[PDB]
Design a protein around this ligand. Structure first.
Ligand SMILES: O=C(O)c1ccc(NS(=O)(=O)c2ccc(N3C(=O)c4ccccc4C3=O)cc2)cc1
Ligand SMILES: O=C(O)c1ccc(NS(=O)(=O)c2ccc(N3C(=O)c4ccccc4C3=O)cc2)cc1
Lengths: 255, 178, 269, 56, 255, 255, 269, 56
């Protein structure tokens, strides 16, 4: 209907409308749907959270500086605090999810900059120490944005993650991250990215409080830039919504 | 400009004389040090032959009031690369007029005397020169930054095929990983 | 079989198949005809030697160890992983999930070791390569009851014949081998990172059946893997920076490209 | 039975009979030609048609 | 298809796309086509240059000052250097051509100005001396823009052309030049002019290295104007493409 | 029609008639025609030079002495000066051609002599120095006839071609050159040779200003001989015409 | 199957199938019957063992190199060209363009080298012949990562068995291999002359897998080429003067024929 | 399928079955008999008939 600048994604109670943007990028060509019986490995009865764990959970906003390295938020561990998603993953052994990762950032028409919004499934990060693994408090968020750096993280005995924008903390060239579903938030025109992740794993259902199946990375390829004066604080706000959640094996609260 | 995020951005600025060169690199993927670590080039280093067209999408990531036109030209090997826009015109070019749809695809067609070409350097076959020139200088109003950026993207066409597999040179090891 | 070009001609209508935002995460398909005019060209080129399987189905050496026939290490041991050779590893790490059968071929070659032993004469060493499934028994001394191969597969190969070959089917707890695992094995998120039990096909031990010559002989078992019946899902960036560890993705930061001169130079340094 | 299929020609026929009990011991499926780039390329919800601009 | 801001003219190898502009102005109502046998005066066999002498030859750019007089480029003598058009006119006695004269000039939305883009067939220029004819090196370009002046060219014995914007160097009021096919490049909105000239002459085919059948004139009616600062160099770039070229009488290289 | 002494080859503007001669020798059995789509490796649009690059370009005449070694003219490099053939090969990366090589030599009926007119495709010449390659100014003509010699070219560090009539400068016996399409110009009767070369190469189209696909060699097997007096200057004039020319990849002027 | 003669008899009419100018570049076909009279003779002779393929399809040795199993050159290297043996080369150079598949057979034979080393006993050397496609990696030290044969083909052959054989298909950038190239690779017409990239199937390296005996052993890899599925176009003179270089047609002038006595002598000198 | 063809006799039958995936690994085409000397011999435009002189 008319212009494609408009979009409106209603999931449950919360709606995200955007005045101006572009197309929604759908997964690898699959939209998250429930797991059928010919893939169901669980023998127990699953719950149906429906609309009450499919609302757009608005994670922490982070401020984009004129020159800023980039950010990443793990996916089952950014929602391990918010709402009933954070409950269910803890009371249930197995969980299965899809996402609507919607990154929204506005800017004036005198500002320029360009974010790459990718969603890397299975981002296994390296480490500054070449024989130690990361910690679980540097590697993961807490719904907070972890940010990289533009200089190598110095080696020692530290278990801090290796964080360099250009290697993406994985040891792959940053410019090749575009294979994975993504979109760009070029501030010239297009002010949001919508990436619909379908459930991707080697097993049909997996624990979410020990395994992080998706990692969102928002990397500015063209630094934010403008003239003197104006506004100097253009945040990037992430709204993520679980989609087609399904759990099994009703244990008890844990870690 | 090969250890930061400065590598991927192509500096564009308003210069009063038009006919200045924006960038220039040969088309010779899997050998050229511009496409040696790209996604297309890295798949290409496992093959000895390649054939097909290649798409170079240039995306203007300037201000939203900045304008400019660029003459994106591909000049086949027959001489040693243009040094003026007036020479670049003669090739296969595409004048990109900016203003909404912030990308324009210059498609490089297959011009070769053979049905394949080497990925590794050779001089029986070569791939010519890809250059960009200002067609009409970047006009930027007040309060808008006068230095913009362009991004170059490399992709393969649907008339693309690779033949004869070999193994990469860009990976190495000494002793086994303990 | 690839696509073909067709005649076009001039274009002056509002079509502009060139101009289109690539900001939407959509990689547009543009043919020669769109930026110029190109007549009908038939292409008979074939995009076969580029299939997922044919790419991965090439035997690559994953490892090799040495074992004296008379001394200390009379047996070698290897936990099966393709993560010991850079070459094969980088090909597998071009996909997040892969599923395949393996063909294990062992190229065992013997070399005499310098010694002052008198009248060294070999009587055709016979080698035993034994596969021990994950959670099997573990031999120590080379005479242990373990080597009876009660249920454990083994190839017995007399030297000077076609190298031993055996197949292994797809053995994984899951439904695909994970080449990248983000997660721990422990619920408290400590210990090993991405050392998941899905790509751990037990151990493979090898030893000399006989006592060979009077003198010492050292043999070198070279292991070859060849992926048959491959299905690969989720493509991903090839590794850039060099590998550092055989179970981690640890790396030292390095260049984004190979450097050259200016932005307008036409020759690589 | 004997499966007869054309040799991969550029621009004929070979008997092949599986001889092993398992189907994980059959020769590789080197011939298996399919292409479907509507996945990673153009993953968008509503396909952009090449005759107008993607955005309004 | 959708907005009329877009246009795309593909002739041979080079394409000119423009994001924003208006309609193409087609000749007097005729689009250049090959000369039929009922007009063919030549008895010899003509060549067909096709795509290799139908690409958009980008002539010299000229810089529009805040106040600038105007410019003109003769048509068969701006292309007498570039590509194979410059060859063919010299090896062939007779030639017949149409054109796609596309004048492109961009500006920001804080700039104003307005060019008149006319194509005067048979522009016979006067002279400063009222009894001498022009020279062939002042009158013609060399693919370079010749510019007028706002004050009368002083008389003497000089053979320099009479150049005054308001008389157009022809002795006709400048405001009446709009009869001829044209377009305006009002910088407010509309950033190119496309004028499709069909072959216009009294004879069916004529030598091009002695006769100039069309003269493009680009005259700013509203001077370029803006505020202090910003950019101060808005060039005007001309891209001309021969269309339906046809030659005859294969002589030898000449003048 | 009547006698076979007559022949008349009209290509474009120039006609070559001959009062007396013999049959035209057609290639290997193929007459040059345009390359079809099932051989077209180029993806670009080719030009059609037609009649304007299919005229008989009359190369340099050379004088046959009483005893003279022989001559050779490379084929794409004897026409790299004359007419539009010399232009097109320089503006275009790829080119495809056939030829009508017509060697004409007249003599009186009191003169005797006999030329062998062969056209050797891919004549790769040796060198006087047994470890150096030829130069590009001794090996090639300039539309001029290069002549051999009857004594070995002395070795040194020179890059001059090895030129001996009897080895043909290739290291093959001269008497076996007749496999290739040819004809004889026996002065007793038969005063021209017409050899129609079709395009012969391993690739469908190739650059012509770096590769010479044909080499015409005119070797006198029976020296010119006569009595004292009469005329003493019987030239051999070569008229070559491109046939079914086709180019692609419209670059710019080069070497 | 060749043609047959048929009865003729006297001829007194204006036919003269003999007299005809050969100045027209037309090689006339004259039978026995034209110059005499010959009755009907049936010929069952067969012109098969003269076909283009059968002529060229014979295995010819193109080269052989030597490599010590313990010392310096532990590997040999060869840029594939048929231009190293006079015999095969002259057959190929009878055609301007040829197209074919290759069968590479390697006949590796080992010879013990004289030494004062004590108790030299071999344990069946295994040789590796590896094909490196053009623009591949190049091994240096014999232990380099390059020899992992990650994608590069290799034949592993244990000594004392049928010699290794492998096929190569037609690999050429063009549509035929050029046996004579007149032109340069450089647009300025300098450098190499006729060193075109169409007959350059990379390199072939070979080495000892094992450490063999305690003493030194030198092995000799002999390379055999056999053209299958041959198609040959444009015939040309066979080479007269002897070859001088493996990439040029350089020669020293020599005789046009072997000499004899007079023009009317009936016996060769 | 099995291709049966006569052995090259002077004046019978052999089964041959291609066993490899590629068609560049099949045995040579030793039998492939054709002759057509109207090429290099007599390449003239208008064929000279053997009953009169070529020239007038
Ligand atoms: O290879 C295995 O299957 C095999 C090898 C060792 C083994 N471990 S054991 O149970 O400790 C064992 C250890 C030694 C012997 N053993 C001897 O001590 C001996 C002395 C003299 C002759 C024969 C033998 C002989 O077998 C038998 C069994 C079991 C099986
Ligand atoms: O043949 C190849 O595939 C192979 C041979 C050498 C090679 N190059 S390397 O990456 O420099 C390398 C160099 C040496 C070893 N290596 C050792 O240093 C060693 C010591 C003791 C036992 C085994 C080994 C062993 O493999 C492993 C790899 C790669 C592969």
């Amino acid at each position: 209907g008319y212009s494609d600048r408009a979009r409106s994604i209603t999931l449950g109670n919360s709606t995200i409308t955007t005045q101006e943007c572009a197309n929604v990028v759908v997964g690898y060509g699959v939209w998250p749907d429930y797991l059928k019986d010919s893939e169901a490995t669980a023998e127990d009865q699953p719950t149906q959270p429906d609309v009450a764990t499919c609302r757009f959970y608005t994670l922490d906003s982070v401020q984009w500086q004129k020159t800023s390295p980039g950010w990443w938020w793990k996916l089952p561990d950014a929602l391990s605090n918010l709402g009933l998603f954070g409950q269910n993953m803890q009371y249930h052994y197995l969980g299965r999810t899809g996402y609507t990762v919607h990154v929204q950032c506005n800017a004036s028409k005198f500002h320029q900059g360009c974010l790459l919004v990718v969603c890397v499934p299975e981002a296994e990060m390296g480490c500054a120490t070449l024989d130690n693994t990361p910690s679980s408090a540097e590697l993961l968020g807490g719904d907070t944005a972890k940010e990289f750096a533009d200089k190598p993280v110095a080696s020692g005995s530290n278990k801090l993650v290796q964080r360099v924008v250009y290697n993406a903390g994985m040891g792959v060239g940053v410019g090749n991250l575009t294979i994975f579903p993504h979109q760009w938030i070029n501030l010239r025109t297009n002010n949001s990215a919508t990436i619909v992740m379908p459930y991707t794993n080697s097993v049909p259902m997996d624990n979410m409080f020990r395994h992080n199946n998706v990692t969102l990375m928002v990397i500015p390829f063209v630094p934010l830039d403008y003239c003197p004066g104006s506004t100097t604080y253009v945040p990037i706000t992430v709204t993520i919504a679980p989609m087609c959640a399904e759990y099994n094996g009703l244990r008890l609260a844990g870690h | 400009k090969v250890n930061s995020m400065e590598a991927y951005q192509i500096p564009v600025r308003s210069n009063e004389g038009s006919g200045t060169q924006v960038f220039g690199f040969p088309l010779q993927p899997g050998y050229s040090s511009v496409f040696s670590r790209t996604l297309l080039g890295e798949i290409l280093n496992y093959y000895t032959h390649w054939s097909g067209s290649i798409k170079l999408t240039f995306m203007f990531c300037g201000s939203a009031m900045a304008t400019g036109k660029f003459l994106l030209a591909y000049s086949p090997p027959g001489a040693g690369a243009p040094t003026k826009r007036v020479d670049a015109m003669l090739g296969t070019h595409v004048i990109w007029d900016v203003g909404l749809q912030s990308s324009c695809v210059l498609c490089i067609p297959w011009i070769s005397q053979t049905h394949y070409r080497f990925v590794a350097s050779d001089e029986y076959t070569a791939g010519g020169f890809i250059t960009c020139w200002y067609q009409t200088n970047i006009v930027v109003p007040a309060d808008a930054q006068s230095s913009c950026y362009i991004m170059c993207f490399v992709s393969a066409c649907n008339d693309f095929s690779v033949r004869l597999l070999k193994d990469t040179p860009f990976i190495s090891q000494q002793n086994f990983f303990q | 079989r690839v696509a073909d070009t067709v005649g076009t001609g001039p274009t002056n209508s509002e079509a502009i198949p060139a101009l289109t935002a690539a900001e939407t995460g959509h990689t547009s398909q543009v043919v020669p005809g769109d930026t110029m005019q190109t007549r009908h060209v038939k292409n008979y080129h074939s995009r076969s030697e580029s299939t997922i399987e044919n790419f991965l189905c090439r035997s690559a050496c994953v490892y090799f160890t040495e074992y004296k026939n008379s001394g200390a290490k009379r047996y070698a041991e290897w936990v099966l992983t393709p993560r010991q050779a850079a070459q094969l590893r980088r090909k597998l790490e071009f996909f997040t999930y892969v599923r395949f059968d393996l063909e294990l071929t062992f190229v065992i070659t013997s070399t005499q070791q310098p010694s002052t032993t008198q009248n060294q004469d070999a009587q055709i060493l016979t080698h035993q390569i034994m596969y021990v499934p994950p959670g099997g028994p573990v031999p120590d001394k080379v005479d242990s009851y373990v080597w009876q191969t009660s249920t454990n597969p083994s190839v017995f190969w007399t030297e000077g014949n076609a190298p031993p070959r055996m197949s292994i089917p797809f053995l994984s707890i899951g439904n695909a081998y994970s080449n990248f695992y983000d997660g721990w094995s422990e619920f408290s998120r400590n210990g090993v990172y991405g050392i998941n039990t899905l790509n751990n096909m037990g151990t493979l031990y090898a030893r000399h059946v006989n006592a060979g010559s009077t003198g010492p002989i050292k043999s070198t078992i070279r292991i070859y893997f060849k992926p048959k019946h491959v299905k690969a899902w989720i493509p991903r960036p090839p590794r850039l920076c060099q590998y550092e560890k055989a179970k981690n993705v640890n790396f030292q930061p390095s260049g984004v490209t190979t450097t050259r001169q200016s932005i307008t130079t036409m020759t690589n340094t | 039975g004997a499966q007869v299929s054309t040799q991969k020609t550029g621009a004929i026929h070979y008997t092949n009979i599986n001889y092993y009990k398992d189907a994980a011991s059959n020769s590789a499926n080197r011939q298996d030609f399919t292409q479907d780039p509507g996945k990673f390329t153009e993953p968008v919800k509503d396909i952009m048609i090449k005759s107008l601009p993607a955005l309004n």
